[PDB]
């Protein structure tokens, strides 16, 4: 509707102040000595976090123009999280330094559009430098170091995460859940498993807990529910003939099939248990082909060329044994050729390279892990529910950081990598003087993440930086030990991906933000 | 255990449903349809109605026949096989050669 | 292989449905309708009702007839062709010339 | 459109293409992603839904005689036709895949004539003097190849004459 308009410096000043509030709140959570921020909720108990992206989300300002500034800087923090899930606090700091210096350049009377180009060109040069500095992260100790550093230098976290990635594998799936106890615990699952229970509580093979273990069972996959269509007896009989246990996968099994089945299992005629498919039809049908191929079985194509009676005993898949309980069904090992298993995985390559990324890849990889890899679950210990939230959150950040470090490598931490690359780019200039200043502005902003860490430690940000700049290679100051040395030796590592992403996302928003002449907002 | 039909009752068995050879080389998948062709497994004594004589069925055992599948057609399981029971009237045709 | 009808049953086939010659020159399209015209492919033994004397059907093989398409009319597929099976009573008229 | 990367990219599309998926995921001719490549296929355009009404066999069997792939365009195809189709394709009797028309009645119906004329085929006029099995293999259009994925169907090049191509374009001038 009706609009309030600000022009030039008045607009930018309001925007800057809004940005400063957002960034100041974010800065206190950066580094080994970083401090927690508490977010209030009318719903229940407040959340306390050291995670910059979460803090950024919650900040909104009373001044309409200031809010606009904060909202725009909010995105860099949020975008960084989307890319690597870590370094969000660091990204915000870069935006803080870039914007303040950029606006200062704008005040000088320089064309901001040119300043933006200088910044953008400088960013491109900085990114190339990061790749050269980046070193491979492969050993468990380095992975542990990134996990430990990500989790606010918690050694136990890095230790447990390193064990899990090695154990599950490169394409394995790792998740985190709360713990019953006060101690952190790791759970690893191998083979094919899913969150499906048994339709017949009555059929329990040996351990009680709804536990069914079948030895050298035949596995049945179907596309229909069996109510009054009990017919399929020659298939069931063929199994009775075999003298082997039967595992059943289909949309649903009614009491009619179960009633006859229960008597059959109890007196020793046949040992058979049935469980309902994965869940949603496109999803269950999609996962059925792999189950059958993995076990060497055949999926019954009700839809295509198969019928309920029609299906030989040989069609059914084979496994050494399975484990079943009310909540879950697990197969020890279906017998299928390595080539066929790998082959399902091979067709999955299109599935892996999907435009969707979020959601599709997470579920897809879980299928893939089950097909050939392993799945790990981490439980987090803590006396109270809120402590658990903080501890668990950091563990996830470390998990994301390790995933990022493995794929793109690591660079020295403490902000040393950004300051070290800045010295290299002292030779970068472009089309005109305004761009040259913009380039120069970005180089200066690079220094800030390093100094915030030192600032949060209660020490002179500028003095530590002068010695760090004075140093060579990976030399730097360790905030936690309060002394100088080789950062790599220290165990402080920054994944290359988070560092790169932070700089890129921070600068892209900052370049446009500094070029704003007029701002439009609703009246009080 | 082969069934003995009771007068005017004919026991026949149904053949394959929508056999995969219609229209040429095209395979037509079954879409929930049924077939009227079968063989006569057994012949009853004949039709009793009107007392004076019992008329023998105009059919013999082992013939290939066409019949009207309706309410008058009953289903029984013989030696774990499917058999249909209907009257002479329900059988529409005889397939020869 | 051909079809042998089961007494009193007549096997006939339909001509063309709503042929484009109605009213004269004008072509009138199909309006979702069927035709009562047909020819007799085969003749059954006759009526077996009332025991004595099985009476032969009045309709000879190869005739062109008009019939009432009622419940007593069944459809069979013979050598991949469409045929109709009904009793003598269902047929209403004979087209001779 | 918005790019995934930080770099600007250009995409060029050759020939006739539309946003249609395949109703038979099962039939994939060669590449993965549900990709179907039919070599010198016959193209069929129809005005009706296909379910229990199977009667189109002489048209479909005619295709079988040829030994060439068949592309199907219609309002919809359901599992009954697809079921017979998947098995027929699996044993190599016929290599056939079916897809749904462009989308909306005045939309898809309008775009069908051009597809047919471009490929040299005939649109089946349910509305006019045509029936489900009334139409010879002559009617079906021809193209050297077609690419089908879950989201889109593309025809490499339908074989049609320029006078017909230009003519369709010429009638488009009012449009
Ligand atoms: N003990 C330490 N000594 C020096 N630098 C550290 C130490 N721990 C962490 N850092 C650095 O400070 C950065 C910020 O830590 P973090 O809380 O994880 O912020 P992000 O949330 O990563 O901005 C790290 O990425 C790392 O480079
Ligand atoms: Mg972290």
Curated annotation (Swiss-Prot), chain A:
It comes from the Bacteria. Its EC number is 5.6.1.7. The modification N6-acetyllysine is found at residue 116. Its main location: cytoplasm. InterPro entries: Chaperonin_Cpn60_CS, Cpn60/GroEL, Cpn60/GroEL/TCP-1, GroEL-like_apical_dom_sf, GROEL-like_equatorial_sf, TCP-1-like_intermed_sf. ATP binds at residues 29-32, 50, 86-90, 414, 478-480, 494. Disulfide bonds: none annotated. Belongs to the chaperonin (HSP60) family. Forms a cylinder of 14 subunits composed of two heptameric rings stacked back-to-back. Interacts with the co-chaperonin GroES. Can form asymmetrical complexes, composed of one GroEL and one GroES, and symmetrical complexes, formed between one GroEL and two GroES oligomers. The asymmetrical complex is the functional unit. It was suggested that the symmetric heterooligomer may represent a transient intermediate in the chaperonin protein folding cycle. Together with its co-chaperonin GroES, plays an essential role in assisting protein folding. The GroEL-GroES system forms a nano-cage that allows encapsulation of the non-native substrate proteins and provides a physical environment optimized to promote and accelerate protein folding, probably by preventing aggregation and by entropically destabilizing folding intermediates. This is Chaperonin GroEL. It comes from Escherichia coli (strain K12). The gene is groEL.
UniProtKB/Swiss-Prot annotation, chains B, C:
GO terms for cellular component: cytosol; GroEL-GroES complex. The modification N6-succinyllysine is found at residue 34. It holds the Pfam family Cpn10. SMART domains: Cpn10. It is found in: Cytoplasm. GO terms for biological process: chaperone cofactor-dependent protein refolding; protein folding; response to heat; virion assembly. Heptamer of 7 subunits arranged in a ring. Interacts with the chaperonin GroEL. Can form asymmetrical complexes, composed of one GroEL and one GroES, and symmetrical complexes, formed between one GroEL and two GroES oligomers. The asymmetrical complex is the functional unit. It was suggested that the symmetric heterooligomer may represent a transient intermediate in the chaperonin protein folding cycle. Another study shows that the symmetric heterooligomers are substantially populated only in the presence of proteins that cannot be folded by the chaperonin. PANTHER family: 10 KDA HEAT SHOCK PROTEIN, CO-CHAPERONIN GROES. This is Co-chaperonin GroES. It comes from Escherichia coli (strain K12). The gene is groES.
